[PDB]
Amino acid sequence: NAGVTQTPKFQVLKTGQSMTLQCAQDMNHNSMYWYRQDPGMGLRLIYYSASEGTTDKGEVPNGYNVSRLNKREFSLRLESAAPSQTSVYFCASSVWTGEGSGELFFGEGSRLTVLEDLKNVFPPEVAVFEPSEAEISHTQKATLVCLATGFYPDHVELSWWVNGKEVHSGVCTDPQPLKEQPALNDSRYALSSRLRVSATFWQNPRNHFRCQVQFYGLSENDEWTQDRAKPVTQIVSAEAWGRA
Amino acid sequence: MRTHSLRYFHLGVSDPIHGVPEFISVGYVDSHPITTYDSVTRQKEPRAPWMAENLAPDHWERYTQLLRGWQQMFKVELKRLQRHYNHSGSHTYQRMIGCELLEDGSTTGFLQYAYDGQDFLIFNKDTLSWLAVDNVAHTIKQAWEANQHELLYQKNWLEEECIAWLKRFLEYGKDTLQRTEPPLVRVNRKTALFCKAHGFYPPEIYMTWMKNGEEIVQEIDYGDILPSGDGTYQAWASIELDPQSSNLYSCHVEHSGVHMVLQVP
């Protein structure tokens, strides 16, 4: 009962590189679809597969091919990636094609960024800033801030960890990153997040706070030639302790 | 415009003889095949030249993909039915969907299935329900009626989309479908009087015999309306002669708004 499973969640590619996106569904559906989603426009179909053993082009097939491997699996291939293929890709499936009213079930999406050169790829710098004492005495609450700055492309996942367990209550992370230089097409990004707790919780010296950012970047086979460290997929974190 | 219709038929066969398709789908406008698809070719293709001439390759490509999907769905349904009937051997599953645009402007729409050539499930798009003929159909009825959106979709397709397609194809094929070729009609003796008509289009025609100005339908033998092979049709009707009394016999033919009477001297 997994629904639609597609991989990978994130991928950076160099112009000309090849890539396969995988999609499987365990719902015994007959029809499968690959879509791309871009800002300011509706979903555009790339290729679809009305049933096992047949596939056909959608609206934007150029630069892509597909394989309906079997009833469960529909893969999408970029043989020679191009910057215009930077997009978010969604696999979807439906019970069949003849169900006029039948809805689509979507996978979680795959975010692809295709770059002329990987010298623009940077992991985030992550820092945590402890609550203001004035806030604590004025409100009896305490807001920690996490800043994740200088990263590119926007392939990050920020999370807060309190006493070694991930928390969501009391957290707000910006839904969109800030372009550090709004005028540049390849500007690096910044992202802020807040975690707010009661002053009593912050004032227990054995409570531990950590902001963690998973960055999806380069892998072993990506070529690296710059003087700085190769910007591989990695986790960057920063921490604070409660203050009596 | 006289009455016209659009219909699509599916046939599935569960254990076909070698080379014979397990799945065929054919569209018609009136009596004219317009489209064909089967599991051997796996391609949807025109069957009338005015369809080929007015529908671009992307039309045939798209419906080819849809019919490949419908072929697989039909095989699954037939497998289910034959398992639930507990039937061995080769069995058939059929569907017919379509609509009529009547001369007075009114419309009809219909959707039904058959198993082994007998009614199995019949859609009522006014009550939005399925009529089941037996308990195998009744299980399917329950499942389909639990999907209210699909019933609504089918009502909309029958009432709106189907009629729009029909009007579109009727204009493509107007030189064929809207023409009139009047019948050539003759009487001869074979002891019965035979009234024989040929060369006419459209195929709808009514022939009968009147005796002294009265129509005794029970005494008349009506021949079928039959394709002559050249796009026109032929038909006949006979009545028995009474050797004991003289009577005025006349053949009456109605075709495309024109009535004809041939009195037998």
Add this chain to the structure above:
Amino acid sequence: QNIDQPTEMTATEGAIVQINCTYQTSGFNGLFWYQQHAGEAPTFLSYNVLDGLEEKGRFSSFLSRSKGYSYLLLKELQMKDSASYLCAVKDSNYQLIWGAGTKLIIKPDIQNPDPAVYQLRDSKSSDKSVCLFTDFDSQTNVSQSKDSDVYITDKCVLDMRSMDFKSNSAVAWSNKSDFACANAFNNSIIPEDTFFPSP
């Protein structure tokens, strides 16, 4: 063939919003609405194909075939309704045409506003000074920085669930020596009673 829906709508928590979708297609085999939370997959909300209104919990979907128009009606808005809403129409060849989506933004109802700008504590690992504008009512808008070396994020709503407490906040930061929380949000119109603790 085209489908149109507004780019963005903003409404208040607890209120009602109507998201419009108009379409011009060759043929019509039904209209779908999908919900798409930011960074997540679209999920199916509704389908209409005959004229009328269909209800489903707090959401209703309406369709007029002759006007080529549908709306998605959200009642008793909650913060979790913040998402994009995608309209899509199935054409005569059973292909979907997708609208570009409507981003729905929900303003929380801030019961007891206490607007303030606080200086967070420095991190020994960072050269940045960080300022938090917080606890302001949802009518306040946060402007981007006019200085290229000052970074200001837009407002964000946080929910302290244990205390049934929501608050707006925005963050400003810089490593410039000229930067102070007293001036961080000078390009924003902020409430007159905003609290600025002494340095």
Add this chain to the structure above:
Amino acid sequence: MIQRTPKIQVYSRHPAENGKSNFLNCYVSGFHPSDIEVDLLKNGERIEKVEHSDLSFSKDWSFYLLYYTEFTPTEKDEYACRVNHVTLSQPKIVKWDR
């Protein structure tokens, strides 16, 4: 299941005339299921150059087909249609009656 046996009708395209070219038609209808075998006969021998329409579908779920061949009728030559179907024990032969 009920299997329906084919109705078989043999006739010319036009009223026949010795010495004048014509078409011999065999119209086979109302049958179910769809497998069927159709031959035209001249003097009891199978005609080779024979054409037929695609299998066709009736509203009542049965099938029909038209088999035809070009011919010139004469006084001597006898023509017929021979049909086999699962409903028939032996092939059924209908003569062309003019």
